């Protein structure tokens, strides 16, 4: 199995900047390498093949290079349409293997998340279930840690986390956090707490409520 | 030169089989290998194997040898991939590729789930009723199958400040959620309604967000 080591693994770039992505192969692959790009919910589009051949229809920004073991893809001036994940593919020998991918993000000034906590709805509570929801939305960068606390102690199961992708105008991300318990365990405790850790702070960002009504 | 065209999204039960198809168009079908690749959030992109429709020669990844069967039909210029004994680990997007050209991919979902209408819950602000400039409302759509679901706010009229988080699996069924931020005056004097529709089960639910007593 030839191993491909793609780097870097995620980059924070600007529109109009010149980008360079690399692939090292564990042995020599004789220029049998492709470079392809995949957008969210979309099939791969190959950009370049045999190391440096442009594919019909690809802007001439894109340009491939290398020989032996170290390959490169350069994007001379980043355009919004270029945002996605980039991969290299070695097809020198079987099995075919791929790099792990390189994710491009538009950089921006750092923003702290704006947090909201939502107690269960009456309607959910009238059916045995209790879901506690927490929205951490509009923040940057994407790195965020969320911990849930019932009456002072960490609860690790029943949590559901969902991320949005970078947003097209203001460049922030967002996440949803749902803690699901039964009515009975929900009704057995009082103080529910959402704890969010992010670069923009030292002390975590905390949101809570009390079921006897805070 | 032209392209690859894949068969439609498949929904199978554990322990069954699927046959996926990949139609080659606009090029000499017998001069190029067709390869099958699997993509999952967990493992990333993995090669299954490939066929050479000219010579009939095939090659497989040792991990799919015994599970995946590759065949080609020259008269219809269609390559096929058969997958037997399916489990939830085979749930993925499958792609045929010429190495330079890619088909669009087929989604195979392995599940026992039965079609089930979603439950929709209105998420009202927490009591206290903050004195901020804005207010964030929310709407939680729980336990449906299959994906998809479309959710709107105020029938589509509300589009600013909305976030609809990709659905996720929870005990075999899907869960989705969404939030909207509106300024303080607005809610609650104006009414904000969450609209959910699930084509699969013929459901269409509307849910107004009333303040908490």
């Amino acid at each position: 199995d030839i191993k491909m080591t793609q780097s870097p693994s995620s980059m924070y770039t600007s529109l109009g900047e010149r980008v360079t992505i690399t692939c090292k192969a564990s042995q020599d692959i004789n220029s049998f390498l492709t470079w392809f790009l995949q957008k969210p919910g979309k099939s791969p589009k190959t950009l370049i093949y045999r190391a440096n051949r442009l594919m019909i229809g690809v802007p001439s920004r894109f340009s491939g290079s290398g020989s032996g073991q170290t390959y490169s893809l350069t994007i001379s001036s980043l355009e919004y349409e270029d945002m996605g994940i980039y991969y290299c593919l070695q097809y020198d020998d079987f099995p075919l293997t791929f790099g792990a991918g390189t994710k491009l993000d538009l950089k921006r000034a750092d923003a702290a998340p704006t947090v909201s906590i939502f107690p269960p709805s009456s309607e959910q509570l009238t059916s045995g279930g209790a879901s506690v929801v927490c929205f951490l939305n509009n923040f940057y960068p994407k790195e965020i840690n969320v911990k849930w606390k019932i009456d002072g102690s960490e609860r690790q199961n029943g949590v559901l986390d969902s991320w949005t992708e970078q947003d097209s105008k203001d460049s922030t991300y967002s996440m949803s956090s749902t803690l699901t318990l039964t009515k009975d365990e929900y009704e057995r405790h009082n103080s529910y707490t959402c704890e969010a850790t992010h670069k923009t702070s030292t002390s975590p960002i905390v949101k809570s409520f009390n079921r006897n009504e805070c | 030169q032209d392209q690859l065209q894949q068969s439609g999204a498949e929904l199978v039960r554990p322990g069954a089989s699927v046959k996926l198809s990949c139609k080659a168009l606009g090029y000499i079908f017998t001069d190029y290998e067709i390869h099958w690749v699997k993509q999952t959030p967990v493992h990333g992109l993995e090669w299954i194997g490939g066929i050479h429709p000219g010579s009939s020669g095939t090659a497989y990844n040792q991990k799919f040898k015994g599970k995946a069967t590759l065949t080609a039909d020259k008269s219809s210029t269609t390559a096929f991939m058969e997958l037997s004994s399916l489990t939830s680990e085979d749930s993925a997007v499958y792609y045929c590729t010429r190495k330079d050209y890619w088909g669009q991919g087929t989604l195979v979902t392995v599940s026992a789930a039965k079609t089930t209408a979603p439950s929709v819950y209105p998420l009202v602000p927490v009591c206290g009723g903050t004195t901020g400039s804005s207010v964030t409302l929310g709407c939680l759509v729980k336990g449906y199958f299959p994906e998809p679901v479309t959710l709107t706010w105020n029938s589509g009229s509300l589009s600013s400040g909305v976030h609809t988080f990709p659905a996720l699996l929870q005990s075999g069924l899907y869960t989705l959620s969404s939030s909207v931020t509106v300024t303080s005056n607005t809610w609650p004097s104006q009414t904000i309604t969450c609209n959910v529709a699930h084509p699969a089960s013929s459901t269409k639910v509307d849910k107004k967000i009333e303040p908490r007593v």
């Binding site: 093949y49 | 190029y32 330079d100």
Partner: peptide
């Protein structure tokens, strides 16, 4: 646009 120099070895 590319020929069986997509490294056809099969």
């Amino acid at each position: 646009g590319a020929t069986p120099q997509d490294l056809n070895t099969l």
